[PDB]
Amino acid sequence: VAAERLEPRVEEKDGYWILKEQFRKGINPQEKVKIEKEPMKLFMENGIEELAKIPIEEIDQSKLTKDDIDVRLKWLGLFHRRKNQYGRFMMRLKLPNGVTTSAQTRYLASVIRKYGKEGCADITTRQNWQIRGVVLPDVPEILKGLAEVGLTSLQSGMDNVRNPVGNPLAGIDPEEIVDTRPYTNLLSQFITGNSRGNPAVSNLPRKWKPCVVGSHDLYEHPHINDLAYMPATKDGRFGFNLLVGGFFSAKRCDEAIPLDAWVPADDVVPVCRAILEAFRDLGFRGNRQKCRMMWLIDELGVEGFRAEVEKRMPQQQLERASPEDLVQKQWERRDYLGVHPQKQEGYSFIGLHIPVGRVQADDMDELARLADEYGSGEIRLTVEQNIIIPNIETSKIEALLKEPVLSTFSPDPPILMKGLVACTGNQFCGQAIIETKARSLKITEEVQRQVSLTKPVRMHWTGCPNTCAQVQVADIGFMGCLTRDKNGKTVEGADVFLGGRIGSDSHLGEVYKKAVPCDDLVPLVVDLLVNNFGAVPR
């Protein structure tokens, strides 16, 4: 790698970061959008106020404003559903470590309730909230309302640092390694500039995903993150070994690799900043399929990339990885659904199943009520799109289990439902090839009617090759496609994946059978479960 390759390609100009004039050749259309107008201005210079007043039919008549609503608004966490819900916006938060409050939950419910049949909410595979139905004129008031209840939606889409994932059992599990909340909180505060916006990390070549590990279970999926902090002691000091570059895409899925770096716990934010600066400064900005950070690591080599991180650390110091980390390889991933004792004597948490992560306003209010009556007003989201209500006096559990809403959001659903994960799909997503959430529920119900089993088989349904529902981590994965029935008629189908493993002995699954009509999946899956997962016909 020539020394010229290491010249930073962006510069700070009037508070924002922009591609230098000599590096603008050959860039992709999204890079052109960012140059034409700085997306962060919509928030930081309150550009959204005037934009929100323009009727959407008028907005669509000019490239600048159409790009504002279809692209730049994703820096404020707003996602125009142009194809499938025209004129409505999905809104995505920052929710470090998946932690929410009852007050926040009620606020989100009040927003979606306004939109009737156009509104609902979802828990995401990054233990985050999305709300639906938002109209542009309401955006300024919603931004204000979110701020009032201690939420931000900043920098949650496009070329930004995505939700910081942590241990859903942080602070409450007798078996945790380290409470991840302080670290994910710090990362979120850094990324968003304490909810004011942070332009230094908002002009990346591509999205970038961080997680902090605190569980032996590896609930955080460090193997598939751009930056994973693995807790490790080095020379008698607590800190983290760093894994880099994990990502999924239509083209390529790669597990994170060691940076060969350890940082003391207090250096979590400094090293996040150094890695982001290196990626920002040096990353390819051509073909979008070659812009994730792993591509930079392959171009420079991991050592070349490491040197770039090191030069951006305070005092330019970056220690080598500790030979061992604190994560025990002898471990069985634990079910968190149901009632479990906390490390605080006399308290329990309860994991509740949320079918395919989908809730309505009334459901959110009920969950918020439970958290107030039984817990401490806290609701935690998980990456399997479920919830945990912590801090429940154990004496209250008997009464809790009789609550009617627990028949719908159950502490002990059938085993296949416990592990079922599904993305948005074509109900709302314009990229989706098939419908996912309703279909996956229907198929899983029919499968479980036919077989019993004891192994916690994890089934993931994703609507297109972007693999937001991570089919490559599943015991059985389903990737949306169009295929043909026996008569040659177009029908929805799935490419079926096998081989995904999570925890310390992680592995990426691969396509097992292509183009199976969705209507034909039940017998295929029943047989797979019996033949490979010890299932028994009923």
Ligand X SMILES: O=S([O-])[O-]
Residues near ligand SF4 (CB under 6 A) are 423-425, 429, 431-432, 462-464, 466-468
Residue 28 interacts, among ligand X, ligand SRM, K ion, none and using kind-specific CB cut-offs from 5 to 8 Å, with none
- For position 158 contacting Cl ion by CB under 5 A, the verdict is yes
- For position 248 contacting ligand SRM by CB under 6 A, the verdict is yes
- For position 160 contacting ligand SRM by CB under 6 A, the verdict is no
Read off φ and ψ for residue 371, nearest 5 degrees. Answer: -60, -35
Q: How many residues bind ligand SRM (CB under 6 A)?
A: 30
Question: Of these, 95, 354, 451, 525, which contacts K ion (CB under 5 A)?
Answer: 354
Give the amino acid at 310. Answer: E
Q: Cβ 462 to K ion, closest distance in Å?
A: 14
- For position 128 contacting K ion by CB under 5 A, the verdict is no
Q: Cβ 161 to ligand SF4, closest distance in Å?
A: 19
Choice between 322 and 440, CB closer to ligand SRM: 440
Could you give the count of Cα atoms lying within 13 Å of 38 in the half-sphere of its Cβ?
22
- For position 207 contacting ligand X by CB under 6 A, the verdict is yes
Q: How far apart are CA 229 and CA 180, in angstroms?
A: 10
**Cα end-to-end distance, the chain, whole Å:** 62
Q: Sign of the C-alpha dihedral, residues 262, 225, 80, 380? A: negative
* SS3 state at 17: strand
* SS3 state at 514: strand
Choice between 77 and 503, CB closer to ligand X: 77
Q: What is the DSSP string of 317-366?
A: --BPPPS--S--SS--PPP-SEEEE-SSTTEEEEEE--GGGEE-HHHHHH
Segment near ligand SRM (CB under 6 A); pick from 169-177, 270-278, 386-394, 464-472: 464-472
Question: Of these, 97, 102, 130, 440, which contacts ligand SRM (CB under 6 A)?
Answer: 130
Q: What is the DSSP letter of 76?
A: G
What is the CB neighbour count within 10 angstroms for residue 253? 19
CB 201 within 8 A of CB 177: no
Q: Cβ 80 to ligand SRM, closest distance in Å?
A: 8
Q: Cβ 194 to ligand SF4, closest distance in Å?
A: 30
Residue 158 interacts, among ligand SF4, ligand X, Cl ion, none and using kind-specific CB cut-offs from 5 to 8 Å, with Cl ion
Closest CA to 42 of 137, 135, 138, 140: 140
Question: Of these, 247, 262, 279, 284, which contacts ligand SRM (CB under 6 A)?
Answer: 247
Choice between 432 and 529, CB closer to ligand SRM: 432
- For position 241 contacting ligand SRM by CB under 6 A, the verdict is no
> Residue by residue, what is the 3-state secondary structure of 191-258?
HHCCCCCCHHHCCCCCCECEEECCCCCCCCCHHHCCEEEEEEEECCEEEEEEEECCECCCCCCECCEE
Both tokens assigned to 127: 């233990």
Q: Cβ 436 to ligand SF4, closest distance in Å?
A: 6
- For position 92 contacting ligand SRM by CB under 6 A, the verdict is yes
CB 415 within 8 A of CB 457: yes
- For position 470 contacting ligand SRM by CB under 6 A, the verdict is yes
Q: What is the binding site for ligand SRM (CB under 6 A)?
A: 79, 90, 92, 122, 124-126, 128, 130, 156-157, 162-163, 207, 209, 224, 247-249, 292, 423-424, 428-431, 466-468, 470
> Residues in the site for ligand X, rule: CB under 6 A?
157, 162, 207, 468
